[PDB]
Structures are given as structure tokens and as C-alpha cells.
Design a protein around this nucleic acid. Sequence first.
RNA 1: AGACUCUGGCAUGCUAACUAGUUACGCGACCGGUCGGCGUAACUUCUUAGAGGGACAAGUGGCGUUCAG
Lengths: 61, 122, 313, 325
Amino acid sequence: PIKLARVTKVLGRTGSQGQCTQVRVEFMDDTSRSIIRNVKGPVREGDVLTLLESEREARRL
Amino acid sequence: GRVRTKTVKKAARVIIEKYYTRLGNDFHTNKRVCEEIAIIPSKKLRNKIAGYVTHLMKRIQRGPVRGISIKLQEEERERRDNYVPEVSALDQEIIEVDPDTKEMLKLLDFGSLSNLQVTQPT
Amino acid sequence: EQMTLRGTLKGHNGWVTQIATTPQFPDMILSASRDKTIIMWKLTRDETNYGIPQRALRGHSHFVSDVVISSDGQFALSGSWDGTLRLWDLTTGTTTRRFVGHTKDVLSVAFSSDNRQIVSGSRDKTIKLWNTLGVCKYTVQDESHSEWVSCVRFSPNSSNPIIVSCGWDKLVKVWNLANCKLKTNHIGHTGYLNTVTVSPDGSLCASGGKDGQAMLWDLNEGKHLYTLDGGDIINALCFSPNRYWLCAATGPSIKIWDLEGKIIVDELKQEVISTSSKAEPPQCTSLAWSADGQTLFAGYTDNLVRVWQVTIG
Amino acid sequence: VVADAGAFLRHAALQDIGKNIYTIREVVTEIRDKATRRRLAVLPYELRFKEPLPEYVRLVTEFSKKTGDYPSLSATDIQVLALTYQLEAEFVGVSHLKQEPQKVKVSSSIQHPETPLHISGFHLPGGWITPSNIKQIQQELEVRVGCLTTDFAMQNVLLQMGLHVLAVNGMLIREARSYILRCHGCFKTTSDMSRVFCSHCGNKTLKKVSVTVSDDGTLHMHFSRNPKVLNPRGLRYSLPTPKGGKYAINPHLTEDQRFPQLRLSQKARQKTNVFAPDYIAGVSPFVENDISSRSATLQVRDSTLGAGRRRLNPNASRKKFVKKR
RNA sequence: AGACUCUGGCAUGCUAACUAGUUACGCGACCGGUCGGCGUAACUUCUUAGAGGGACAAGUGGCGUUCAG
Ligand SMILES: [Zn+2]
């Protein structure tokens, strides 16, 4: 299963070298399910992602 | 970034302090009047001064500043300072006083005061 | 009797500083601005817009402070901050002559019904008489003004040709041609002066500035007559050609006066936004009365010309 | 329906309730909260700014100093009070309202001022905070014009006049239960609860006294007939020699003594809020302590931190290894 | 150090340029047009080199002890 995404907020920079962006992901499946994910590359607020696995949740706490 | 120069500041303060009446909020007008008031060599410096004046007046017309003295607010301040009411605040009809205080008064010859009301600590 | 917004005029980037209306044509109106551009407007008075720009008179290297039309709607004249006094042709949209003499900011420009009488008022502390062709008639220096010469107008009257010059030196100075003699000094102001406007009849002049008090003087007598208080600083002063009405542009709003009873007529302001509470509203710099007697032309700091029309009732 | 600053502050959306919605232009500009100003930027605009006549302002202040609230009031506070008085005089009869209030009735009890009565959660011998009770927690709840004042000093003067006023609720307020401070040296009352020195004689001598104001216009004070309150215990203690400089913390003895500025760094005075939407991603459950800056090494502390430590009498015995900052 | 000065970016505004250039007008060559062919009325767009302008955190919004920023 492939789920599409939104960007609610761009939080900060994670990763070793400062390559990964920590981003708040709203779902495009109508649900207000806000999962925080890590992205590689440039992401601005209002981007729409293609997540391969939606069950995953990135480094919270 | 960018920060204001001491010289620019001081000159601006002088210009405001002396000739507040001539200046306004229009930057260009303030520049030109500055050019016609003070002995300025550089254009850039003059511009800076004008900017500072403009900012200052934007700020000052809302409320008075900590730094300088305005030729209207000196008068206003004076008026506010040399104020006195019609009736003195110590000339009161009935003054509330402790029993101890009353006793003290009595032990000073002032038992024949009329305006005192000896209130008991209930 | 009420005043209502008929339309809005957009075309300038910098502040609209002076509007000049022509009596000959009630369809084309000229407006000077800070964006170094004087736009001739073609009026259409639609629901879409009140007027479309027709020609933009580019030529000046600084703010065009004062523009003035001619007796006939074929010649214009502008005075800009660069010290340039430029005679424009409104037919071609091109300059005809360039009047060079001032060192400082040329603030004001004066033009007669006779046409061959041009007076420029500059921060150079100098009054200059000009021909239409470009010849300087007389340079005024002998006790002209202690500070900047703010505004200069003539007397549109069949009587004595009288020029009125107000300055930043807190004095209104009255001059007469062919002799160039100081006729009347008018002392009674707090703060600098901005504008002077002479009655369409040619009997009275109104001066204002920083105090917010429009001081009315007589031309024939040299006498104080009226004092008209206001809220904020006075930017522009105006007379109606038919109604005997002194319209003064105050701070953010315009205040119309009836001199016959010293009564307020109406205050003119349009702002709905309460979100910008700590921000100051756009001031009204220019004010001009149209030849119709119903239409007002008001120039603002919002770089926007607003027109006002009379709705009786 | 005259709105005070508290109405917007508590987000009382009573724009549907009244039709005579009038306010001062000053009180709406004095608010520093962003959410209330955001609310101001959206709300259905039927409000109208009004400033009253100086004749009415003079008449409010005339008895405001007689009721003993004028020092506790603000300039803007008097403006709202005057607005209501002149608005009532405009529409309704002026003869309803009385000039000069009533003589206050003294009624003493043996209860301590610190007794948690009128605190909603606390309960003596059922008094519960429920998900139904939360909106109900206001005060003592019981036609055309009124007020939206949350400040008691406001409410006191309003109800002394006989002006029918209300709160965040729909219905009119009848009884007003609150505390005021009385100085036990000069006997001059202040409605300002925050202050610790009196406005009159300047000593640290203000003590809490409960008051009730009826809609009729009657006042009564409950003085404490409890010896624990007026006890001269930890009051005389020898004080250090006054030190000046940047670091010297003086013992705080007048309301207007100039302290040297000692603030805490922004790393230090950040409290952790768990209800932030982006909280979970932030590495640690709590916001880091400051240990690097000078404020930490000089032991600069918040005003709330070390509160009960001040309440202990200086002539006592601290533990053998502690020093009281 | 900053400040001072220069420099560069901008001007169809100005001052000029027989060692700069354009436009128009004549003559010529070529098929009503093309010509770094040649000859003085247009004055500066290009080129040049000067003066004067022009930007100062100017304005708006947000953040800020409501100030410095
Ligand atoms: Zn006291």
C-alpha cells in the first residue's frame, strides 16, 4: 500500500551532517493523522510526499 | 547586520533637540531640512542622520523618549510638575488613628484635637 | 448636502503631490507625483474606473512637487526637486522649454491667465520671474524670505496683479509686479507654512501649515479676517469657483468649510481596517477642485488619487 | 453594554447578547496578547469606539475617592466607568443612580484569611470539578445597558452607583465576593491584590480582608478576629549594610527602590509545555537547564521561586548546612 | 576597526566632445529598399568623462523587556 502525504510544518534539521529534514506529515487520506517523518532533500511547507511505508514513525523522543 | 553610528546618533539628537518644529515623518523632507540646518560634509552621513531623525520622530510622536529634551514637552512637563490641587490632601475632615497614637498625643499636650477618630483594632 | 466617493485613480508609484485641473477641458486632468512622473488622465467615469492614464510626462530626475496648467488646455508647467522648471506640451507629451536658474529644490510654480507670467518658488530662498520663452525677468533677493519659499500663487482678477508667497520662515509675503515691492507682511502663525490659495473672485487668500489653523487674509485691505481650526497638519488648501467654499486637506482626512457662517460641511475619510492599529493612516497631500463645482480631486500618500462627488440630500 | 479589557481577554463572545456595544479606544490598544488581537482582527464588527464628556468623568471620580477605590483604579478604568454612566444617562433615567455611597458595615469572624473557601476544587466535610462544572466556574451569578468588567475595583464602584452590571455570563451580577487589602497602620484600603506595600504609608503591612457588594449598593467587610494575623513575630531582625553595585541584592523594603537589573537568560526561563503540537519530536521530554551562563553562577532566581522561604521568620533556625540564597 | 575616499551598478534628466557616435538631408553605386560609399544641418540614445541626483534599514508586515535590534 502507497499513501500520499502533506507537509504541516517544517521542524528542523536532523541527520549527522545536517542532511535530513524533520517534517510534520498530514495525510491526504482525509484523516488528521499527524506523523513526524524524516526527508532527504529540500522540503518547504506545502509539499506533498509519496511515502512507501505509512506505518513507520520517525525519531520521536 | 547594520547598526547606528555614535556620531549619527548625537547629531540627530542635536537636530531634534533644537529644531523639532521643522522636522516631520517624510524622510526626504527631513533630509533636506537637515542639509539646510547643520554643517555636514558627507552625503551618506547626512542621509544616515536624516534616517535616524525620521525613526526618532516616528517613535517620539507616539510617546516621549528617555534621551532628549523637546521645546514643547519641557513646557508641558513643567506644567505637570508645578501642579497643585484646589484642596490639600492632608487637610482631611476625619483622620483615623490608633489608640497607642492617641495616647502618645495625649502625652504631648494635644488631647484637645478635634479631627481624630480613634479606631479600635477589631 | 453630502460628499461621496465616485471613483479611485491608480497609476503612480510615489506620492501624489499636486493635481492641476483645467477650466478649458472638463475631461482631461493632470496629476504630479513623487515617482518623477506627471500623468495626464483621460476620464471615462465607468464602474470599472473613473479615469485611464493617457500620457505620462517623463523627464524629471526627482519628485515633481508642483504642476500647473495654462489658460488653454495645450500647455503644462512643472517644478521638480532637481532645480528644473519644465514647460510641457500636453498635445505632444513632450517638453518645450527648460527653465534653469535655481540651485535647490523647486517647490512651487505660478502661472497667470495672461500666460506670459511665470514665478517659481524654491528652497533656494529665491523668487524668480520667467518668460514663456525662457528669459529671466527679475531675480528677487532683497528681503525675499528668511527660509524656504513654500507656495506661490497669483491673483486671477482684473484689478492689481498681485503675487502671494508664503514661506517656512513663518511669514506670508505679498508682492506686486513691475515694481517688485513688498506690499503686505502677514504675521500670525505658529510653525512653518505649506500652502497658499487665492479666491476665484480675487479678494481673499488662505494660508496654512503646521499649526492646523487655516488663516484667512484679505488681498485689497491687508487685514486679518478668519481663523479656521483643524485636527492635524494642513497639507493643501482649495477654493470652489462657484460655491464660496474653503476646502482644506488636513492630516489623514479632508475638511470642508463654509466661510459665511464658519461651519464645517463634511469630513472625508475612508478606512475600514482596524488590524493596522499601530500604523498611521495615509495622509492627503494634494487637493484640487474641478471646473464642474461638484468634483474634488484629492492626492494621497497612498499614491492614489481619490475623487469626490456631490450628492444633494 | 460597555466592554472592559477583561471581556476580550477571557474571549466573552457576547456580541450576540447586547446591541449597545461600546468601548474605549485605549483599552483595546493596551492589550499585549496576540490571540485576543487576532480575535479583534476577525470578529463581526458592530462595536463602536466612544469617549465620554469630561463632566461625567469628573462625576465618577467625585465619589470614587469616597468609596476608597480611586487609587486602585486606572486612568482607562475611570474612562470605562464614565462611559457607562453617560450611556445610562443618555437612554435610561439618571435618577435611578445614587450619588455618595453607603456607610460600610463591620462584621468580624474568627476565620483565618487564608481559608480556602470560595476556591472551587477545595471541599470541607460534594464539591467537585467536573467536565460540566468548568464553564460554570465564574463568581456569584443571579436590561438594556451593563458592563463586562472582570476587575473587582471596577465592579465595586459600578455597584455602589446602582449600575446594573454583569460578567462573562449572560445574566446580571448581584453579589460580588472578593478580597481586598487593608493596611493595619493607616487603615487605607486598596482593591489591588498584587501589591504588598500600601499606597499611603508605604510599609509592608497590607492584610487580606473579604468583602461583599450587593446590587442594592451595600458593602460589608469580614475582618479577621484571629491573633495569628496581627502577630509581631518575624519582624524585627538585623539587616545587612546597604551594598551597591551590579550583583548586590538588597532586602526589598519600599515599593520604589531601584534594584540592579538581574534577569535570567532565555535558556533558563523557558518552561516546558507538553501540549505543543511539535513536542514529541524534540529529543528530550524536558527543556534543558541553563548551567553555562552568568545568571546561573550568580544564582539569579525567579520571583515565584523562593516564596515560602521569605515567609519564615529570619530569627529562626535553618538546617546546619543550608544558606538561603 | 569603524568612519573617510574612491569605484561599480542607474538616469531616453543636465553639461560637452574636428581624436566619439547617431539622425536627417544632398551626391553616387546597386536592385520603392541595401551600402564601415562620401559631404556638411540634429544633439547626446548608444561611446566617452564630469557635475548633480539617487539608499537612509526609507516603507509595510511579523518577532522582539515592546528598546536595542
Ligand atoms: Zn498604610
